[PDB]
């Protein structure tokens, strides 16, 4: 039944896995340093490996200068055997979470833990490794999604994605935090492979701070950005300004409607177009 | 302090296993606890009756020669509550989805829910589309499920982002061809909802679309806004910013700019005459 | 090759426990390590002094008859760094929130932060709204916290998405009534920020909104763009795409299309006369 370590003194009760490389050498990159897993009963035997598991793995070869280590969680899909178990959750050594559900990556790529390592594993991929260390990556066939299920209860269904801007840093000892600075952006858009590589977003919606903030003044804009056919340059086209003006983002450049996409009727207090 | 451990000196792996069976040597069952690791804290003169924080390995379907299904959950106990009210907040499904279900999101009865399919079975009125299973992250929260992206500037700029990354090909097979973004690529940010019978497709959205195929010197895009009319169930493109930067209605001679009691104050255009 | 394990042949669960106490048989404390599992790699002639990758169970509040609070963190060590600089990158809070805090996001001192409330206590100048605790995912990163949605086409189409899912009712109680999307349903995608005193509500946003209540034959929506003016702290609806697809200002006789040095090039409309 139950089983356990007890520390009565007030210290910690910790379980360790100790591993070495071949012939007392340093433990290696992507070596399984430790594991915990369930093995289910088939009727007369257990499965040959874990069907669900926690794995601790080496990140780079160990040395006096590298103690690199990362984590994955493995699951087995219903109707599949342990041959087809999936390392669906990967907490990278950089601190990124990769979520890779069933059907997203082949077995061969089970040790992929970053853009850098994905690039090495799939030479044609060429994603920007500058994105490593930024947060969550989801890889799924065709349609990777985030679903935000929001039952009303007695309030209102109000799911949200919220950027939170600030000046300063939480990384140092001082930890100064201050007012949103000018140049603050929140981009929601799409990058893609161009046949050679992934790069910057090429179409987007962005919330931007309209200058610096203070307690009585927090100005924003919402900007829509696209890229033209024959071009690789994402540009601001139309925006809602801080004062609420819907405006083109350059003077005398962008049209409202076209020949075969004409506005039905325009409603404006002033009947004359200001030129 | 009271450390404890397995050691493999040879170079092999040091792994801890949990072995479980069904009743009377039968196959282990669906949602059966196959293994667990958990802390039990000291109350003064006893420990808690169960773990207050735990990792659980669970069966997905009854085990057979054809099914070795298994999934994971992580359990926490909220401050000011007892283990009676512990929360399986993190659920890594057998399909590979992560479900995040914070305190107050789901009743105890739904602690074994690991998919839309299983949620549909547990709550018959729910009827979400199970086609969404296997797609990634699901967050269930009372009223306001959120993602917060906290972005301290440092010496650069506060630049939080949500980034779709389009490509041709597949990472799933042995060949693993990857290529240029294809026409018909989309990134939808919108809302589905229950219509009193079921959840379905998004009914209002902003979308980034590829404007055809991409190549090294040409990566065209559009931003489209889509809504659904009263008395209708059909989400339609209404207004978009085209690749060349034109703000346009998405159909000819259909949509107005402004209305009788929502009039633009003044229109600024270089050409003072409306092109009909 | 090595292995090690518990076996329950009877059909019961094989569970591993960690038992911990406070000092002198007292209650176990807030943020006390209640249990841990960790790898310790070989340096050539010794192991590392602590785990380089680990699962930790931790107290949330001091334990009592009324509090059994516990939470979870996962720790990793970045390549090219020693265990001195290991990162508690994954934090599943006692409230059930997931915090994702990659390398370089937070100092060592903040390793035990598990909520906005605790972050606020640790960094007094921070002042984020604790009303956001319990809502789901938080990502903290230097400058650019991101979510990447990598979408290989295969034989279909690259269609990454962020999907709100509105419903009436609750999954939290025993009844678990679920029903039609209600009026006042919203999906906000926008930015809050520090104003020099605190974080507060979003100050610029895009929102998908239900245009009233839904039924099986009627699921109306709008897309609204909201900004805040210089010298003001009030986020206001400015322009929206209505359910019938009208692009409209959100107040009558208030907002302009274009300005003096930001003029529309040419306006295309079927009717050449502006309806006043």
Residue numbers in the entry:
A (entry chain A): 989 to 1263
B (entry chain B), C (entry chain C): 988 to 1263
Please, what does the article write about this entry?
The well-studied Siphovirus T5 has a three-fold symmetric tail-tube, to the end of which three long, L-shaped fibres are attached. These fibres are made up of a homotrimer of protein pb1 (pb stands for “protein band”). The L-shaped tail fibres are responsible for the initial recognition of certain Escherichia coli (E. coli) host strains, binding to the O8- or O9-type O-antigen of the bacterial lipopolysaccharide (LPS). The bacteriophage T5 L-shaped tail fibre uses an intra-molecular chaperone to fold, which is then auto-proteolytically released to yield the mature protein.
The data collected by Garcia-Doval et al. for native pb1(794–1263) and pb1(970–1263) was also used in molecular replacement experiments, but in the case of pb1(794–1263), no density for extra N-terminal residues was observed and the remaining part could not be refined to satisfactory R-factors. In the case of pb1(970–1263), no satisfactory solution could be found by molecular replacement. However, we did collect data from a new crystal form of native methionine-containing protein, and refined this structure at 2.3 Å resolution. The structure of pb1(970–1263) resembles a bullet. In the mature, chaperone-free structure, the third interdigitated region does not contain any regular beta-structure, although there are many inter-chain main-chain hydrogen bonds. In the mature fibre, we do not observe density for the catalytic Ser1264, suggesting that this residue is removed with the intramolecular chaperone domain upon maturation of the fibre.
